[PDB]
Amino acid sequence: VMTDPIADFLTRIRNANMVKHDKLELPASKIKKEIAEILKREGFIRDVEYIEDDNAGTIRVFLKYGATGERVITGLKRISKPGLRVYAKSTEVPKVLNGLGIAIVSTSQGVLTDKEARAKQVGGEVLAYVW
Amino acid sequence: AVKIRLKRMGSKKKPFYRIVVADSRFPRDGRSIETIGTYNPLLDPVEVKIDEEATLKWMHNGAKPSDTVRNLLSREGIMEKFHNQKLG
Amino acid sequence: ARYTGPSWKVSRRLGISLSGTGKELERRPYAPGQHGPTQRKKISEYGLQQAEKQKLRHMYGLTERQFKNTFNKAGKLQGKHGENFMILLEQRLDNIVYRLGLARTRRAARQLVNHGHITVDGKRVDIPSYQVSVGQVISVREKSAKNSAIAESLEVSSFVPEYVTFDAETLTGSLNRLPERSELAAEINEAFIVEFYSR
Amino acid sequence: RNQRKVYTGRVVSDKMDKTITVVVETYKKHGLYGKRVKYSKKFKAHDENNIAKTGDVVRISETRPLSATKHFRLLEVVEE
Amino acid sequence: PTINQLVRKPRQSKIKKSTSPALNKGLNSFKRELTDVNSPQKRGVCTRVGTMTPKKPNSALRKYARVRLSNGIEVTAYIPGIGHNLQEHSVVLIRGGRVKDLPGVRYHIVRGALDTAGVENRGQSRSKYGTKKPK
Amino acid sequence: DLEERVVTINRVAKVVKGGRRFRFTALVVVGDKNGHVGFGTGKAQEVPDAIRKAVEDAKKNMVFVPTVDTTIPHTVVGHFGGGEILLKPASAGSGVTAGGPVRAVLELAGVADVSSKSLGSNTPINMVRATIDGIKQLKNAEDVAKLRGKTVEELL
RNA sequence: GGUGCAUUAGCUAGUUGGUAGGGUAAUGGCCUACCAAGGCAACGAUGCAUAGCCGACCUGAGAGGGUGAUCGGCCACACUGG
RNA sequence: CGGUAUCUAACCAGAAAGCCACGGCUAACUACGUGCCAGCAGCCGCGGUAAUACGUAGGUGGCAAGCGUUGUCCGGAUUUAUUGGGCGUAAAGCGCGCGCAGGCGGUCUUUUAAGUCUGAUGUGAAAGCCCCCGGCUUAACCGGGGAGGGUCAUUGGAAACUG
């Protein structure tokens, strides 16, 4: 969290995915909140709980695996990096893995996945890819 | 001294003209102010198309057509109309 | 025609029955030359997709320089890139003459047209490269109607293709509908052609 | 009617008589790598009464040329 | 390098060099300068002819020449074909193409364009060596 | 019901106390057009007997590939060894566009349209490994839906 | 908005601003007399070298890379200088 | 222009095919002559008396009124790598610190709208690439209609993220 607490957040998911862990916790923030809720809407996360603390609270995330020991979140990549910010126009929002994946966009009407941002015709900074 | 005139396009021995407005000083097929229509002399009943509205406002602004263009408008029945707005 | 050489070497070197079936490969089917009657070497994949490029233009006997242009023109046409190029190349009026039986072979049909013996929609046309579209009419201009060769070449009449209509009473013909690949010869693959030019 | 272009900026100097120099610092996506780079160019405005002081923020407007380079006039001192 | 370290100084490509430097120069006799143009061939005149020994492992004897070009540069060229009729001080036409064996020589004389006649008795591959059709 | 095809034949040699001794190694790829394919290696003193020993190896490494609409579903990159190859779907009827020993697996598998490019090294043993690694990350539409608790319509 | 060189670091003295006046179709240091000492530059001033500019052309999957002939628009020149 | 385009009628297969290559890359093989000589060569490299690599001849392959050679540019070249590379041993972490300018910056709330996204209006000539029709006996070519092309300007909106 030295510079980018979203790039770190994605990494903390990927590291614990590789070693087949089950739960993981990390300090909470308003932007970290819904980015963790979106992943619940597509089953990428088993469930999420919030914790209230003295400094800012933390967020506990229950990662999900399919039976037969197959991972569900197979990777994450960041696009808006603090060293180089990227913005995408409405018609030029990409599709990840021909629509199998999901992307996160911080449009003008709250953080939104591009399934409906293209349906709502808005663009904004592109936060991450998930696939 | 804007004058309605023509503009030679097409392959050799197959001309195809444009009814185009222009300043007198500029070349035959160089800069032009505005295109109006075409005029094909190949077909026996000549192929003529003109705006018949835009040219009317140009003529009220002082454009004097070329000799052959003047014939095209008359056979088009649109030179008579211009004789009927000048009374107003 | 354009290639005025012996008519059998190219057919049998090519490994197919060019211009019909079995006339030229009936006996001595060894590949031409001093060698060829000895043994066959395993063709590299480059040979695979080159010789089969040759199995098309040699089938119709047209110089290569327009083989591209027809191929390039066929690319803009919607569908499958390889299939359409076969379809469009079938529309040349040499076929439409040869398919109707007005000529025994293909190369005779080219020699037939070039001397201006036929008219599409009642106007003389002098070149084999014209492509005919649905709803046109092919007559014989009613000038050399009694020439012995043409009536003789209509005597064989193996099997008129479905996608054309013809009768010798008035020597007319048309293209009923666009052919459908399978209706063609289609004995060769088409993918090994598109690969070759996408090199 | 038609309006001239109107800008904003910060005062840089006043050592010239009855005129001031203001910087207009704005962002600009780079040529190739697409990284916003701070680009700032400084103009020269007009001050009838020398009211504007260094370090202030103002709004300036384009106009007729008035000197060798002076072609902007002040509208209001937004802050000190 | 990070993006910022790439916007302070950008990436500059290399500079690939010509292999036939004496075919892309020009002399303006009025101002005495070396113009920078391109040209497939240049005309020259011979200074000395003869033979040279090939580098290892090849062990033949090769007929070379030293020529003074139109732009005043003197270089060495190679005479192809079987034999030649090249005396000293003759105008020849030169072109590009090096030979691996001989170390110093880089250019390569055209046969059949000028004083250099056509190679005798070439039944095939005759477009080079410049011999007419044996009617 | 398979259709083995040979790729490359080398000629390797080890030095002994008296001189040199040569042996032949052949790489073959085997498959049927359904989507089942595999590759195998071999080594013997004689080339005709090197190929036969190679196929029996390959018949143990069968793999499957998704073929939605006669084409791979999505793009993917295989990154084994020093050889990296990316695969991306092609438009209908285009045909297989691939290098030397990377089309070999694709033709045998039964894919009709696909693009590719070998960004890594060029050793034929490593291209086949990368490509086989390339297809493992390739998923049908419904399998993804099973894991994520969704169905087909919302995904596409 | 579109070139390289830092083995090219300072440049400018009508210069930068002001008061009147002169001169043009016109604003204007364009010019004049006086006042003050400023103005620009590492976001490349200055100097050196190279080059007419664009719509476009060639190539490339794309981003890009090379060119500015013929056709159209703009500019500059007419044996060299005033 | 010019009795030029075109049409009609009569005559004769007669007057009309060459260039490069054939060891691998790369489609295409034999015989003789020569014997590290003469020579070939884009790279690997061929020739020291049994050459599919020199020279000729027969045959074959490629392309065609053209075929080859040389020169200049793009690609393959991820070989300046934003899309799209790296630095233990392959070239590549300054000998090491203090630090100006610069680059980047923990959590929350309110506000502004430079960045950001979006609506409308104007404009980005004509010819050219693309697409849709139509004319030259077909094509090349020539017409008509559209589309795109801007880190463009004026004005109205949105406030998640950067400032």
Ligand SMILES: [Mg+2]
């Ligand atoms: Mg031709």
Ligand SMILES: [Mg+2]
């Ligand atoms: Mg106004």
Ligand SMILES: [Mg+2]
């Ligand atoms: Mg010049």
Ligand SMILES: [Mg+2]
């Ligand atoms: Mg490329």
Ligand SMILES: [Mg+2]
């Ligand atoms: Mg030979």
Ligand SMILES: [Mg+2]
């Ligand atoms: Mg490159």
Ligand SMILES: [Mg+2]
């Ligand atoms: Mg060392």
Ligand SMILES: [Mg+2]
């Ligand atoms: Mg080292």
Ligand SMILES: [Mg+2]
């Ligand atoms: Mg160190």
Ligand SMILES: [Mg+2]
């Ligand atoms: Mg236009």
